[PDB]
Design an enzyme around this catalytic site. Structure first.
Site, PDB file in Angstrom:
ATOM      1  N   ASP A 172       0.857  -1.211   0.000  1.00 30.17           N
ATOM      2  CA  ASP A 172       0.000   0.000   0.000  1.00 30.17           C
ATOM      3  C   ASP A 172       0.888   1.255   0.000  1.00 30.17           C
ATOM      4  OD1 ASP A 172      -2.291   1.647   0.173  1.00 30.17           O
ATOM      5  OD2 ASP A 172      -3.116   0.551   1.888  1.00 30.17           O
ATOM      6  N   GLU A 188       0.073  -0.698  -5.077  1.00 25.18           N
ATOM      7  CA  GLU A 188      -0.987   0.337  -5.136  1.00 25.18           C
ATOM      8  C   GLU A 188      -0.420   1.623  -5.753  1.00 25.18           C
ATOM      9  OE1 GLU A 188      -4.326   0.479  -2.612  1.00 25.18           O
ATOM     10  OE2 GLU A 188      -3.545  -1.084  -1.247  1.00 25.18           O
ATOM     11  N   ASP A 243     -10.863   2.151  -3.305  1.00 32.44           N
ATOM     12  CA  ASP A 243     -11.297   0.917  -2.604  1.00 32.44           C
ATOM     13  C   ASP A 243     -12.723   0.560  -3.012  1.00 32.44           C
ATOM     14  OD1 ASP A 243      -8.860   1.311  -1.428  1.00 32.44           O
ATOM     15  OD2 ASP A 243      -9.610   1.290   0.660  1.00 32.44           O
TER      16      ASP A 243
HETATM   17  O1  LIG Z   1      -8.814   2.312   3.543  1.00 28.97           O
HETATM   18  S1  LIG Z   1      -7.564   2.663   2.997  1.00 28.97           S
HETATM   19  O2  LIG Z   1      -7.183   4.023   2.990  1.00 28.97           O
HETATM   20  N1  LIG Z   1      -7.363   1.980   1.527  1.00 28.97           N
HETATM   21  C1  LIG Z   1      -6.086   1.264   1.501  1.00 28.97           C
HETATM   22  C2  LIG Z   1      -6.151   0.101   0.523  1.00 28.97           C
HETATM   23  O3  LIG Z   1      -6.412   0.613  -0.783  1.00 28.97           O
HETATM   24  C3  LIG Z   1      -7.222  -0.899   0.953  1.00 28.97           C
HETATM   25  O4  LIG Z   1      -7.336  -1.924  -0.035  1.00 28.97           O
HETATM   26  C4  LIG Z   1      -6.824  -1.525   2.273  1.00 28.97           C
HETATM   27  O5  LIG Z   1      -5.631  -2.278   2.059  1.00 28.97           O
HETATM   28  C5  LIG Z   1      -6.621  -0.479   3.374  1.00 28.97           C
HETATM   29  C6  LIG Z   1      -5.937  -1.082   4.594  1.00 28.97           C
HETATM   30  O6  LIG Z   1      -5.644  -0.089   5.571  1.00 28.97           O
HETATM   31  C7  LIG Z   1      -5.899   0.794   2.961  1.00 28.97           C
HETATM   32  O7  LIG Z   1      -6.416   1.875   3.748  1.00 28.97           O
END
Ligand SMILES: O=S1(=O)N[C@@H]2[C@H](O)[C@@H](O)[C@@H](O)[C@@H](CO)[C@@H]2O1
Ligand SMILES: *[C@@H]1O[C@H](CO)[C@@H](O[C@@H]2O[C@H](CO)[C@@H](O[C@@H]3O[C@H](CO[C@H]4O[C@H](CO)[C@@H](O)[C@H](O)[C@@H]4O)[C@@H](O)[C@H](O[C@H]4O[C@H](CO)[C@@H](O)[C@H](O)[C@@H]4O)[C@@H]3O)[C@H](O)[C@H]2NC(C)=O)[C@H](O)[C@H]1NC(C)=O
Ligand SMILES: *[C@@H]1O[C@H](CO)[C@@H](O[C@@H]2O[C@H](CO)[C@@H](O[C@@H]3O[C@H](CO)[C@@H](O)[C@H](O[C@H]4O[C@H](CO)[C@@H](O)[C@H](O)[C@@H]4O)[C@@H]3O)[C@H](O)[C@H]2NC(C)=O)[C@H](O)[C@H]1NC(C)=O
Ligand SMILES: *[C@@H]1O[C@H](CO)[C@@H](O[C@@H]2O[C@H](CO)[C@@H](O[C@@H]3O[C@H](CO)[C@@H](O)[C@H](O)[C@@H]3O)[C@H](O)[C@H]2NC(C)=O)[C@H](O)[C@H]1NC(C)=O
Ligand SMILES: *[C@@H]1O[C@H](CO)[C@@H](O[C@@H]2O[C@H](CO)[C@@H](O)[C@H](O)[C@H]2NC(C)=O)[C@H](O)[C@H]1NC(C)=O
Ligand SMILES: *[C@@H]1O[C@H](CO)[C@@H](O[C@@H]2O[C@H](CO)[C@@H](O)[C@H](O)[C@H]2NC(C)=O)[C@H](O)[C@H]1NC(C)=O
Ligand SMILES: O=S1(=O)N[C@@H]2[C@H](O)[C@@H](O)[C@@H](O)[C@@H](CO)[C@@H]2O1
Ligand SMILES: *[C@@H]1O[C@H](CO)[C@@H](O)[C@H](O)[C@H]1NC(C)=O
Lengths: 392, 390
Positions: free
Chosen positions: B139, B172, B200
């Site tokens: 991420d 990502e 998301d």
């Molecule tokens: O909700 S988030 O800002 N989107 C991110 C990612 O894009 C999500 O898929 C998930 O992995 C989250 C885990 O904290 C990450 O935080």
């Protein structure tokens, strides 16, 4: 409206959301607005247990009309799609134990562009009465002025009265006023058995959320107006169609019971899942909608993507709906003091709580000092019935 | 990424959308982010036919970490929620014939505020490799520059390679770049087995539509870079949860197959309807997603609240998806010349057409002159497979 009708919210079926204005009987015969579609729905309303559950009114919406009035200046059924006319459809519908509803417009044209009722209120009213119509839905398209709108609705009401036939009178008056001025609900109530307040429903969770949010935002204006003979109409049930998840369908059925809404299904009774059928025919949730006290419920609380609604019922009972508005994750826990429900009346000194939705479960006795703990699905609702009791 | 992995889009299960960052094991032990959750899912992936259908990677998302690195500067599993540690969870998942995925962040903290990998890329890589991790989701939160973003994703890619272990690298990078500058997908693919493009997913039809609209809008830039070793990631399958009608679930399965998306379920395998399970385990539709040619499909047309999408397959086959975006009324009629499909070759001189969704049925032989007529449910999709007669 003191016509002695709609003492509980009216129940039945209306074609609009599912079938709309489909005039193409050559290429789309199964979904075209025709006498055969209505006759087929009527048989199924009897044979598939809808009549027994309380769905009584088989309603025609826009696009039943010939493009022009006859030589005698009366409305006519489209000759191709309704060759046997409204009168014979009425006899068929009455023969099965049901009542027939029909549609018209206070103004110059229906919203689909068919003949408006302005200039003809009394003859149109008499036409429906001769035909054996038991309900009229009266739309507000193609109306020049607030004055005409109001005059027309008031006129058609007295016109129907003059006929001396029992005809449920369903008005869109408030909805066509909002662009100009706040409606006066005490006036509307005098003339109408129920009234559309907000924009047409469609087959979407967004459309449900938007109707609930307008209703809870406006509830101080509209909740106390509602009662036997006069109901707020938040538009059709769309359970059994395509756009709502199981949880979103449970939320519509729960909250239409809370809101003392008329229950007009707009679906295809020939093609409906057993699950959707069981929800729409759920005897205990219909019994909340049809509660003889007839006081509309309301939003008690909102926050943290939760809503709590409640409705007072006959006999010191309350219906309670908990909605999870979070559209991510899993079932969320919600706890509330049973003392905060039913204005502190429901569980003084105790209540027996039955979960009705999503599944029927007896939860048991809650003392006035008890907490109720629930888990609510995303976009779903838990519906509870609280029975005041001395036991425990 | 030429590590020999993701030769077809990666299939598995990822906790995020359904279970999120639930740290409350006291009040909610069933649904909290713990090794018990991952072991229950591993058992059911075997026993309920998921591994057989091709779901192979059991993946941990954010909120598995202890709040602080250990004495030796390493990432640790929360000692209460993951008491046997990741290496031991990896051993168990491996004993079932499955693979384990884990999550880290290129910046200073993960999105949920646990330890970031900035400054520890080489150690973090070696830790994951030592633990027996088969996949990393990486991420982009808490990253102060595009320079640091690029250098971090590239650096973790090389650091994983150096470990000697085959680890699927899910990035990502494009998602975090796109607000500021257009990503270079040719470069991202050199470093990544798949890459999140967009916001998301959540358990809603609004979510699905927004992901499809973003993909069709950006298709000129993303469709041709996809292929064996490198895929566009439009985020998790949410079929089997709460927010999607049956028709919306069919749309997600159909279009994730057309798009050669990784298929990561985020659901509760302990509580899934038989209809959701049969859609996700649909052999014919997975065979489209998993087509060995690996050519991403695309939107062919849009208008009258209809979409037509198509995907070229191995051996002169095409997949065609027809979406009804009208959210009112009933099944709507749609007709297209079969000559307009698959660049004019799918049905020249003829093709056999099978409907796969929403139900399987053989529609028969269509000549190059023919029109395909279909009724499509509001928010639904009809998925077809076309086989050329030559
Ligand atoms: O909700 S988030 O800002 N989107 C991110 C990612 O894009 C999500 O898929 C998930 O992995 C989250 C885990 O904290 C990450 O935080
Ligand atoms: C055209 O418009 C007129 C104008 O209102 C309508 O006339 C009203 O009709 C309603 C419905 O029938 C009448 O309401 C009913 O009154 C009946 C008599 O009430 C009086 O007399 C009793 C003696 O028994 C007194 O005790 C009482 O205080 C009243 O002064 C009642 O028998 C009815 O009650 C029954 O049904 C109601 C629900 O409607 C229940 O609440 C009761 O339990 C009971 O079962 C009812 O109250 C009203 O009287 C009429 N008003 C006027 C001004 O005449 C026409 O009906 C309408 N016509 C058409 C076809 O649209
Ligand atoms: C670290 O990075 C390096 C550099 O990218 C990376 O090396 C690459 O590995 C791949 C796959 O292992 C190499 O391509 C292979 O070549 C071999 C033999 O010459 C083939 O056997 C491989 O594929 C065959 O077998 C497949 C499976 O059955 C078949 O499906 C396929 O059609 C083939 O028949 C494959 O072509 C690639 O050449 C190297 N690149 C370089 C520059 O060496 C290495 O994998 C990375 N290591 C890690 C741990 O990530
Ligand atoms: C993770 O956090 C650390 C520490 O807060 C970040 O390092 C810091 O990054 C800032 C912003 O780039 C640096 O500021 C710069 O400093 C130079 C002077 O050396 C100055 O000329 C620049 O204009 C700018 O102000 C700061 O020096 C640096 N701090 C340390 C301890 O090195 C780090 O970048 C963060 N990582 C990510 C990926 O966000
Ligand atoms: C809303 O309309 C209603 C009914 O037309 C009004 O109530 C009556 O208005 C008439 C005519 O002015 C009076 O003679 C009555 O005394 C009014 N009360 C009742 C209960 O009939 C009402 O006042 C209108 N305006 C509002 C609510 O502001
Ligand atoms: C996008 O990134 C790719 C890969 O980093 C760039 O393509 C490389 O360009 C360099 C310099 O021309 C060459 O040495 C390589 O042959 C290229 N690699 C490949 C696989 O094509 C490309 O230049 C970048 N595009 C833009 C607009 O920045
Ligand atoms: O679509 S509309 O603008 N909404 C009106 C009404 O609100 C609808 O319920 C339905 O009766 C329609 C019939 O044409 C009317 O036209
Ligand atoms: C109907 O049309 C006539 C002729 O233009 C017009 O005078 C009248 O105001 C219209 N009626 C309504 C109710 O809008």
């Amino acid at each position: 409206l003191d016509n002695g009708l709609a003492r509980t919210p009216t129940m039945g079926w209306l074609h609009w959301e599912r079938f709309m204005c489909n005039l193409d009987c050559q290429e789309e015969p199964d979904s075209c607005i025709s006498e055969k579609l209505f006759m087929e729905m009527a048989e199924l309303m009897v044979s598939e247990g809808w009549k027994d559950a309380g769905y009584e009114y088989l309603c025609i919406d826009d696009c039943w009309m010939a493009p022009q009035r006859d030589s005698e200046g009366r409305l006519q059924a489209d000759p191709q799609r309704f060759p046997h006319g409204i009168r014979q459809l009425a006899n068929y519908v009455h023969s099965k134990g049901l009542k027939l509803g029909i549609y018209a417009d206070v103004g110059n044209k229906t919203c689909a562009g068919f003949p408006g009722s302005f200039g003809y209120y009394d003859i149109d009213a008499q036409t429906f009465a001769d035909w054996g119509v038991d309900l009229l839905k009266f739309d507000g398209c193609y109306c020049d002025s607030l004055e005409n709108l109001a005059d027309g609705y008031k006129h058609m009401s007295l016109a129907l009265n003059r006929t001396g036939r029992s005809i449920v009178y369903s008005c869109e008056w408030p909805l066509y006023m909002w662009p100009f001025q706040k409606p006066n609900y005490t006036e509307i109530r005098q003339y109408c058995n129920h009234w559309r307040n907000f924009a047409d429903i469609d087959d979407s969770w967004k459309s449900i959320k938007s109707i609930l949010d307008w209703t809870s935002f406006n509830q101080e204006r509209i909740v106390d107006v509602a009662g036997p003979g006069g109901w707020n109409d938040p538009d059709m049930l769309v359970i059994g169609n395509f756009g709502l998840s199981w949880n979103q369908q449970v939320t519509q059925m729960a909250l239409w019971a809370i809101m003392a809404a008329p229950l007009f299904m707009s679906n295809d009774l020939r093609h409906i899942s057993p699950q959707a059928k069981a929800l729409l025919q759920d005897k205990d949730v219909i019994a909340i909608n049809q509660d003889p006290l007839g006081k509309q419920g309301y939003q008690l609380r909102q926050g943290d993507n939760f809503e709590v609604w409640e409705r007072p019922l006959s006999g010191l009972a309350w219906a309670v709906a908990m909605i999870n508005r979070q559209e991510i994750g899993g079932p969320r826990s919600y706890t509330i003091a049973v003392a905060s429900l039913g204005k502190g009346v429901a569980c003084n000194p105790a209540c027996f709580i039955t979960q009705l939705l999503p599944v029927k479960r007896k939860l048991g006795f809650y003392e006035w000092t008890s907490r109720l703990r629930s888990h609510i699905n995303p976009t779903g609702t838990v519906l509870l019935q609280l029975e005041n009791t001395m036991q425990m």
